[PDB]
Amino acid sequence: ASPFRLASAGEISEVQGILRTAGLLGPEKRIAYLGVLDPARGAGSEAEDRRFRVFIHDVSGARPQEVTVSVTNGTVISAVELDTAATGELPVLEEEFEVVEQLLATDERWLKALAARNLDVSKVRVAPLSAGVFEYAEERGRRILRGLAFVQDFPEDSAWAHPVDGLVAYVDVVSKEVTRVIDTGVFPVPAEHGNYTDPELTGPLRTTQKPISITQPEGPSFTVTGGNHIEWEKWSLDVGFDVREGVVLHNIAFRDGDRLRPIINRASIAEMVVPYGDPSPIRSWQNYFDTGEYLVGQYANSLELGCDCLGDITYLSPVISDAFGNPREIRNGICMHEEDWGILAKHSDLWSGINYTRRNRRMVISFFTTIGNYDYGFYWYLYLDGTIEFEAKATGVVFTSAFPEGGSDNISQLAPGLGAPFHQHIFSARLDMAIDGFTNRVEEEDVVRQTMGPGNERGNAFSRKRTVLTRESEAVREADARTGRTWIISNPESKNRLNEPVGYKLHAHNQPTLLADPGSSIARRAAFATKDLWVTRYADDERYPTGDFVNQHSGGAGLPSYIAQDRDIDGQDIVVWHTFGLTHFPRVEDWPIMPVDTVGFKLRPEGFFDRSPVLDVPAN
């Protein structure tokens, strides 16, 4: 009954049938994206209309289409032909990945390059990577993937240990032509294997780890209704899933006495870019937009009980569409559970004699995705005290290269002859704010140091200052860790009992933003990543910080074009976009499989409640 319910297999089958009957899903067509559309602002008329957005690719070279379908009414609402040289190419299809290796295996230039290196083509795996936009005029309007080669000595070998440096190819995956093969010179293929399940590498496994048993004898404290509606310790929300963004949180609200108070209307990771910092022409084009180009939701893992998620786990199994419009279930793709989180509050008072301790807990909503060599975990946390936190977990196998004789300023050495180029992993969180409703504003808060003098005779005073961001043109902000800079999202029309506007404070990790030269292709295509915080006025069609069609888009789409509208954001329906990321100089300890590293952000209440919201927590 809820408009925010997950897409059903039956809905996806109906979409397929509607598209086919409209003549839009012939044998040459492929679905590159399918997702449910959120309700438009002000759907309080109960007139639900379940609408889906579809990107349709054509493998014969005809123009792709963007289509909107109403499952409710069984009709095609609109269908638009796309000029991809102008607005960007569609996301990469899973079936295009295998095309690259197969096409190169019969190309005379590729075979000559492998022959010079004494490599058997049957052992050469090709990583098919997105192309970006660079100097090659012949690529405009064509679907291009670039391929880098790795040797697999046997079927269970980790090919990442054996990069074939000095060699790259470009492939037109629609016309099935190899456009360029570039060979800059022969590097030795690193010979040491990286097989982290090989007993010769692991040694005897430890026998010292005794079991930790986490159980909930009476079941979990949260309830799931309507398939995806969560209620837990005064929190209320809906867990959505989209093939591009992955897990999306809707309608985050907190039950404060008799009132259900909204906090965030929609929360998601709306883009994530992995730019590489190696200037070698073999890799200097290398930038993954995992969300926008590959779609992280479609590569979600099935999570195993006891290994991936430990404790009393409740799973969601979202349904997506395959390239032909058939429903596909991602079994156990989302884990949900609560976790003990240490001490919540504690005080032993000498004067009253009262000793007081309470324990904290958090609700966890997570999924894991695998894109080639990398694996990313996305974790959303809700805490008893009103804190909301996001954490990304990065693991998997680092992307490798040869390590040059004589060293490198842009590549780490991991093993003899084996290098790992420097790179970043940068995320964009899109937070459609709704602090006590939709009239919100953002203030930038800095610590203020004060000079010793009159009114501050002992030189101990310090203060803070808040600056309201009033228009989009002034709402592109940078971090300043030294001044303790944070941002407060408040509702100027909703006051706490002290007559102050209710608010939430965003705490960033203050990690470096995009390092590339501002004149680079990646700086133009990932402009969101060059600043820590953006605020825009809500609009239905402003969904992603990089635009709708990221693959091979020439740049400027998304946030820089949105904020040019210079709209009023002072007490309006606003969206906060926060950039955060990891800068990775690989270490020896990251090889041959990398231990998890993390980055994230959190939001804490700031005068949202009239007092601590956890006074009614019982004494365990």
Which pairing describes strands 235-242 and 355-371: parallel, antiparallel, or unpaired? Answer: unpaired
Q: Kindly state the smallest distance separating residue 168's Cβ from a copy of itself, in Å.
A: 14
Q: Which of 428, 521, 536, 579 binds a copy of itself (CB under 8 A)?
A: 521
Using rule CB under 8 A, residue 406 touches a copy of itself? no
Please identify, using beta-carbon distances, which residue of 485 and 584 lies nearer to Cu ion: 584
Q: Kindly state the smallest distance separating residue 165's Cβ from a copy of itself, in Å.
A: 17
Using rule CB under 8 A, residue 284 touches a copy of itself? yes
CB atoms within 10 A of CB 297: 23
> Which of 489, 594, 499 is closest to 533 using CA atoms?
489
> What whole-number distance in Å separates Cα of residue 96 and Cα of residue 91?
11
Q: Kindly state the smallest distance separating residue 483's Cβ from a copy of itself, in Å.
A: 7
Using rule CB under 5 A, residue 433 touches Na ion? yes
CA distances to 42, 388, 579 from 509, rounded to whole Å, are 35, 14, 10
> What whole-number distance in Å separates Cα of residue 495 and Cα of residue 377?
37
Q: Where are the alpha helices (DSSP H) in 296-353?
A: none
Which of the ranges 317-325, 539-547, 572-580, 588-596 carries the binding residues for Na ion, by CB under 5 A? 572-580
Looking at residues 505 to 544 of the shown chain, list those that interact with Na ion (rule: CB under 5 A).
538
Given a copy of itself, Cu ion, Na ion, none, residue 554, with its beta carbon under 5 to 8 Å by kind, binds Na ion
> Which of 141, 129, 139, 133 is closest to 168 using CA atoms?
129
Looking at residues 578 to 597 of the shown chain, list those that interact with a copy of itself (rule: CB under 8 A).
583, 585, 587-596
User: Three-state DSSP class for 473?
Assistant: helix
In this structure, are residues 293 and 532 in contact, taking their beta carbons and an 8 Å threshold? no
Given a copy of itself, Na ion, Cu ion, none, residue 39, with its beta carbon under 5 to 8 Å by kind, binds none
Both structure tokens of 448? 């203020």
> What whole-number distance in Å separates Cα of residue 471 and Cα of residue 473?
5
Both structure tokens of 427? 């995320």
Q: Kindly state the smallest distance separating residue 432's Cβ from Na ion, in Å.
A: 5
Task: List own/partner pairs for 340-343 with CB under 8 A and 24 or more apart.
Answer: 341/383
Catalytic: which of 157, 172, 238, 290?
Answer: 290
Using rule CB under 8 A, residue 326 touches a copy of itself? no
Q: Kindly state the smallest distance separating residue 45's Cβ from a copy of itself, in Å.
A: 33
Residue 67 sits at the vertex; the CA angle it makes with 89 and 18, to the nearest 5 degrees, is 135
**What is the per-residue DSSP string for 527-589?**
GGGGSSEEEEE--TT---TT-S--BT--S--SHHHHHTT--B-TTB-EEEEEEEEEEE---GG
Q: Kindly state the smallest distance separating residue 290's Cβ from Cu ion, in Å.
A: 12
Using rule CB under 8 A, residue 94 touches a copy of itself? no
- 314 sits in which H/E element: strand 314-316
Using rule CB under 8 A, residue 177 touches a copy of itself? no
| Residues listed for the chain | 620
Whether 136 sits among the annotated catalytic residues: the reply is no
375 labelled ligand-binding: yes
571 labelled ligand-binding: no
Whether 165 sits among the annotated catalytic residues: the reply is no
Q: Which of 573, 602, 607, 613 binds Na ion (CB under 5 A)?
A: 573
In this structure, are residues 234 and 254 in contact, taking their beta carbons and an 8 Å threshold? yes
Looking at residues 338 to 377 of the shown chain, list those that interact with a copy of itself (rule: CB under 8 A).
338-340, 342-354, 356-357, 359-361, 368, 370, 372-373, 375, 377
295 labelled ligand-binding: yes
> What character string, x for contact with a copy of itself (CB under 8 A) and - otherwise, covers 120-159?
-----x--------x-----------------x--xxxxx
Catalytic: which of 33, 170, 374, 381?
Answer: 374
With tokens 């006051």, the residue in question is 495
Using rule CB under 8 A, residue 105 touches a copy of itself? no
> What whole-number distance in Å separates Cα of residue 312 and Cα of residue 335?
10
Please identify, using beta-carbon distances, which residue of 37 and 617 lies nearer to a copy of itself: 617
Please identify, using beta-carbon distances, which residue of 266 and 584 lies nearer to Cu ion: 584
292 labelled ligand-binding: yes
> What whole-number distance in Å separates Cα of residue 487 and Cα of residue 510?
12
Looking at residues 583 to 612 of the shown chain, list those that interact with Na ion (rule: CB under 5 A).
none
Given a copy of itself, Na ion, Cu ion, none, residue 584, with its beta carbon under 5 to 8 Å by kind, binds Cu ion
Q: Which segments are annotated as binding site for substrate?
A: 288-299, 371-376
Q: Which segments are annotated as binding site for Cu cation?
A: 423, 425, 584
In the complex, the residues that contact Na ion under the rule CB under 5 A are 432-433, 538, 554, 573-574
Q: Which residues are catalytically annotated?
A: 290, 374
